[model samples]
Target: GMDEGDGEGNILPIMQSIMQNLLSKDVLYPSLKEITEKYPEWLQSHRESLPPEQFEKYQEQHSVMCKICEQFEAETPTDSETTQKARFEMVLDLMQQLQDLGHPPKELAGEMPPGLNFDLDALNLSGPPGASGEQCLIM
Candidate 1:
């Protein structure tokens, strides 16, 4: 039943249930409200004014940004605040741009899709207290 042949792949019944749930709008999901509240500076008042397709595009772009953040975090040496600063500053700029365009930044505290919302600490990505020198590598 696994489509990708991985142990974590979805089963047929699960897929069918998800499809049905989405069709009926009965899927229990997180709300953008959480994001708006968490990062009010990165949220636009007119977010709900965006059309459905545009909103979808916003989500896609947001997912891309999350991937970028994960990669940057993974690659940036934890001991070098300069490297981390540059990477995160760029992300902040992008987030602000999206907000100005009425796309609310995604809430990072909640569950998200694959390759999104990485936990570097849990992933053991923290460099030793003071052992600097290109300690991380990006994928």
Candidate 2:
């Protein structure tokens, strides 16, 4: 699970890039079936590159990511202000989670689609002031 932060080292940027690409597509709640069908080649390459345990962890996290999207989609209808706001907040949350896992937001600057405007300073997430560390689970 994302909470464990086990695969946070090298996989963070790859996960961030995947999220950015998905956001670029402008379809926020793509079905798991759609995702699986759409990215087999990329997935295969990742499988080849990652060790077995890490690859397994990645797949678990991917499933959780899909579920989160589905939940958000269910809560926020298309073309609504609420929907847009939820999407923005979710993106920020994801970026913050990545940062907590050690992938800085600066690395993701300019990667997001232009239409999704956000202030980097405003999104600066240092986690809770006095917490030992932050752990984020996709659920």
Candidate 3:
């Protein structure tokens, strides 16, 4: 219906922006704050471009991931090696689930950043916020 927004008139720009953010380890769970705040925004804004079938799946999976991030933020302690290990697995599985959804907002989010799956990659699960109030997830 509408094709005026970045996703419409200048599609590549919007996709590049989101993909770059995600690739930089800046968009995915940078902080619990971003999770509860920006992440939901991601789900909703991108939904406008989704088909009904994709919509329903996202509606379900979005909350499921949020629940994991909740504990990833509050319940889990960052000090333990084993704990971060488990958290890493959870994040891996969560993204794996998204890709499995087929749509997985690829247009909106681009490919899953390689660092996302690596334990010692750019995400740095052990480093929540290096200095800024908002940094990569798990700190």
lDDT of 2 by residue, 15-106 (tens): 54555556542554453335433333445666677677655544554544554465555664555897677765775565444333332122
Q: Kindly report which residue stretches of model 3 are placed more than 4 angstroms away from their true locations once superposed.
A: 1-27, 31-52, 75-78, 102-139
The sequence of per-residue lDDT tens digits that candidate 1 reaches over residues 16-112 is 3443453221221122333433443333444567677766655654554454445443563555788667755665565444433443334533433
Among these predicted structures, which one has the highest lDDT?
3
Q: What digit string (tens of lDDT, one per residue) describes model 3 on residues 21-121? A: 66432345543234444445676787688688867766655665565566556544546988777766776666555434433333333335433332222
Give the deviation of candidate 1 from the true structure as CA RMSD: 16.3
Q: The CA-based lDDT of model 3 is what?
A: 0.49
lDDT against the true structure, per candidate, is: 0.42, 0.45, 0.49
- Backbone clashes, candidate 3: 1
| Model 3 lDDT-worst window of ten | 115-124
Clashing residue pairs in candidate 1, if any?
none
| Between candidates 1 and 3, the lDDT winner | 3
- The TM-score of predicted model 3 comes to 0.41
Question: Which order, best to worst by TM-score?
Answer: 3, 2, 1
